[PDB]
């Protein structure tokens, strides 16, 4: 019913601007995007402060606006923490170590007595919270916390079985600890250091960061100081003190994790195009400091983990940078992957991130092909345990993420499809993260982009279903024989999924129409039971003997729709490009004579998207060696999909399609076009689906991608 007025022409105008507003609005925002944005941690600022005045001034606080800080984020029932998510530990943690620094410096006793009450009242109930429930440290760091309040005369109830339990649980962790490897190399533990005795200084001191902190921890770095009067440990703390006027968070920097989510979040919910020049700006930066070893959270930080590796490598991978997979055999070890020494990968997010970096591999990189298999079982089973949930991410819909990664592999997401199910399952300002305590990442989780992005995709199928009218309309007036059957809506949905811009109709709609009338002339060839001899009268007709009615109807009706699609993109780009198309079908209705008539349809739709866009012509590809060679192996490749039948894709499909993804995405400086080379990629994928999925999951995908609105 495209004759209401929400598909109106002035409303769809408002709309375009109205998103472009958004989005000069995220640009702006993301314009400030610096060493990192997280939630400020009232445990950290509270160890920070503890710190003595370094010139003697008995009495004084080292760094005063970490207190001042502290006593202007107490909430309403005395707690410190994340206010909108509650969660015990984190308030447990938050609160004493607020009152522990403001009782040191004798600052405001009406806040401290507020500050115990809610410790002391909410210590009891630590009994009635599971084992699987506690934040990471907690049975290190609480138990240092209360150590501290003792020394300063602030009574606690050592004999509570809550506390009798919790100290419990501190001398086995304490007793696990190696010491050797502790002491001999960064570990995670270092994150933790506050936490910890039994400590060798002159071999911890050697594993500081670069930025003179231990694992870019200000509570960790800030009992390091107090321990040794370490000079960098201090420089790390005072430059911290001044960027976020006395608040700082439970890690800093965190530029690499924060910029690299911040590509993934805006690629998965289909409006990175709008953010080419600041996504450009943060891969560069990705890839300045890309490190064989892997990559920390902080370029800064010494400490590489596999999450942080495994996206970092998928994006600049993606983004056209040469990268090793050699990287992810410093997270390996007999089999099994690892975050870092120490910790297995057992998280699903992590394994989720590493189970997608691994499929953009190449050909010959075993361990990727080790990964794919060791996380697709590892999420397979736990989404048959009904297990998917990871213990430190409070996320809206990590079952639909995983449940989409193992339905639709990378070589059958097509972009709608992607971007259609990730909008129902980005939580926008609701993804809060565990680490020490709770914390949030406003420019990778954030309401702006979720609304952004709705308004954008909604956008984009009412483009789509007035251009699905438009296609009926447009094969029904070439009235030859045919009617609009399923397959119709499935070349226009195999188009529309893939490129899906607006002002990229004249792309699209070529596409669609072409498949319609491959899938109209090759039906033509079999039901006819046309010969060679027969197939050549019928291109020399489309040039320049044929023989049959319905054989001339059809060679105008071609001809006309090379027409209509050439007439179009003059608006796109001024060179002519009707003989370019008359030479590709030429060229593909003559492979038709030699072989199978699917043999040469990929390069058809491609070089039929290069001449609409007008890339045929901004690039000499010409006799370019990688022309010849991607159209081969993509031309081989569709042919293996489309014919392969009821075979199940096998592992020759997959190495061609490895073959192609390396040839994709190694960019050289006088390599064959990238936006050129993307098309191949673009289109294989599209066969690769429609091979991959049966016709009810097909037509289940249209509805959703096409037909239903984003809530």
């Given at each position: 019913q495209l004759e209401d007025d929400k598909y109106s022409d002035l409303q769809l105008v408002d709309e375009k601007h109205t998103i472009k507003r958004s989005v000069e609005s995220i640009k702006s925002?993301?314009?400030?995007?610096?060493?990192?944005?997280?939630?400020?941690?009232?445990?950290?600022?509270?160890?920070?402060?503890?710190?003595e005045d370094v010139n003697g001034r008995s009495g004084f606080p080292q760094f005063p606006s970490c207190l001042?800080?502290?006593?202007?984020?107490?909430?309403?029932?005395?707690?410190?923490?994340?206010?909108?998510?509650?969660?015990?530990?984190?308030?447990?943690?938050?609160?004493?170590?607020?009152?522990?620094?403001?009782?040191?410096?004798?600052?405001?006793?009406?806040?401290?007595?507020?500050?115990?009450?809610?410790?002391?009242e909410n210590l009891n109930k630590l009994v009635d919270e599971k084992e699987e429930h506690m934040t990471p440290g907690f049975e290190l760091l609480f138990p240092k916390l209360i150590e501290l309040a003792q020394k300063l005369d602030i009574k606690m109830p050592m004999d509570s079985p809550a506390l009798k339990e919790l100290y419990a649980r501190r001398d086995t962790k304490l007793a696990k600890i190696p010491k050797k490897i502790f002491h001999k190399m960064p570990t995670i533990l270092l994150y933790s250091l506050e936490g910890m005795n039994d400590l060798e200084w002159d071999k911890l001191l050697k594993l500081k960061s670069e930025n003179g902190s231990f694992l870019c921890s200000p509570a960790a770095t800030a009992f390091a100081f107090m321990e040794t009067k370490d000079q960098d440990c201090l420089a790390?703390?005072?430059?911290?003190?001044?960027?976020?006027?006395?608040?700082?968070?439970?890690?800093?920097?965190?530029?690499?994790?924060?910029?690299?989510?911040?590509?993934?979040?805006?690629?998965?919910?289909?409006?990175?195009?709008?953010?080419?020049?600041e996504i450009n700006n943060f891969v560069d930066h990705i890839y300045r400091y890309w490190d064989q070893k892997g990559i920390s959270f902080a370029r800064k930080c010494n400490?590489?983990?596999?999450?942080?590796?495994?996206?970092?490598?998928?994006?600049?991978?993606?983004?056209?940078?040469?990268?090793?997979?050699?990287?992810?055999?410093?997270?390996?070890?007999?089999?099994?992957?690892?975050?870092?020494?120490?910790?297995?990968?057992?998280?699903?997010?992590?394994?989720?991130?590493?189970?997608?970096?691994?499929?953009?591999?190449?050909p010959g990189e075993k361990i990727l092909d080790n990964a794919k298999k060791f996380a697709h079982n590892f999420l397979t089973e736990k989404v048959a345990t009904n297990q998917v949930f990871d213990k430190w991410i409070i996320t809206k819909d990590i079952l639909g993420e995983v449940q989409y990664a193992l339905d639709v592999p990378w070589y059958a997401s097509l972009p709608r499809l992607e971007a259609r199910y990730y909008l129902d399952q980005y939580a926008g300002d609701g993804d809060v993260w565990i680490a020490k305590t709770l914390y949030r990442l406003k420019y990778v989780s954030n309401n702006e982009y979720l609304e952004?992005?709705?308004?954008?995709?909604?956008?984009?199928?009412?483009?789509?279903?007035?251009?699905?009218?438009?296609?009926?309309?447009?094969?029904?007036?070439?009235?030859?024989?045919?009617?609009?059957?399923?397959?119709?809506?499935?070349?226009?949905?195999?188009?529309?999924?893939?490129?899906?811009?607006?002002?990229?109709?004249?792309?699209?709609?070529?596409?669609?129409?072409?498949?319609?009338?491959?899938?109209?002339?090759?039906?033509?060839?079999?039901?006819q039971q046309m010969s060679k001899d027969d197939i050549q009268g019928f291109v020399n007709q489309l040039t320049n003997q044929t023989y049959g009615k319905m054989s001339h109807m059809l060679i105008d009706a071609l001809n006309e729709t090379l027409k209509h699609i050439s007439m179009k993109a003059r608006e796109t780009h001024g060179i002519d490009i009707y003989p370019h198309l008359q030479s590709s079908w030429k060229k593909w209705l003559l492979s038709c004579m030699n072989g199978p008539n699917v043999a040469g349809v990929a390069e058809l739709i491609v070089e039929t998207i290069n001449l609409t866009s007008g890339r045929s012509f901004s690039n000499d590809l010409l006799?370019?060696?990688?022309?010849?060679?991607?159209?081969?192996?993509?031309?081989?490749?569709?042919?293996?999909?489309?014919?392969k039948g009821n075979r199940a894709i096998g592992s020759e499909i997959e190495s061609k399609m490895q073959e192609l993804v390396q040839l994709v995405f190694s960019d050289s400086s006088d390599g064959l076009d990238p936006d050129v080379k993307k098309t191949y990629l673009v289109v294989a994928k599209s066969f690769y689906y429609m091979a991959y999925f049966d016709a009810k999951t097909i037509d289940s995908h249209i509805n959703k991608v096409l037909f239903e609105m984003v809530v």
């Open positions: 925002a993301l314009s400030l995007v610096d060493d990192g944005d997280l939630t400020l941690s009232a445990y950290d600022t509270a160890w920070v402060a503890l710190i001042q800080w502290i006593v202007s984020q107490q909430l309403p029932d005395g707690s410190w923490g994340e206010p909108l998510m509650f969660l015990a530990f984190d308030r447990l943690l938050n609160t004493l170590a607020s009152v522990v620094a403001l009782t040191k410096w004798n600052i405001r006793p009406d806040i401290c007595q507020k500050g115990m009450k809610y410790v002391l790390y703390l005072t430059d911290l003190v001044a960027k976020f006027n006395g608040g700082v968070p439970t890690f800093y920097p965190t530029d690499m994790y924060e910029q690299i989510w911040i590509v993934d979040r805006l690629q998965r919910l289909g409006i990175a195009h709008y953010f080419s020049s400490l590489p983990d596999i999450d942080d590796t495994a996206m970092g490598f998928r994006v600049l991978r993606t983004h056209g940078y040469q990268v090793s997979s050699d990287v992810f055999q410093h997270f390996e070890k007999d089999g099994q992957f690892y975050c870092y020494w120490g910790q297995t990968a057992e998280a699903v997010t992590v394994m989720f991130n590493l189970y997608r970096a691994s499929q953009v591999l190449f952004t992005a709705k308004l954008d995709y909604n956008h984009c199928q009412k483009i789509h279903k007035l251009e699905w009218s438009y296609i009926q309309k447009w094969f029904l007036d070439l009235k030859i024989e045919e009617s609009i059957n399923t397959r119709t809506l499935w070349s226009y949905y195999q188009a529309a999924a893939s490129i899906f811009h607006p002002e990229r109709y004249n792309e699209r709609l070529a596409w669609a129409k072409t498949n319609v009338l491959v899938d109209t002339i090759t039906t033509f060839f079999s039901k006799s370019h060696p990688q022309y010849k060679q991607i159209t081969s192996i993509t031309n081989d490749l569709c042919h293996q999909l489309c014919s």
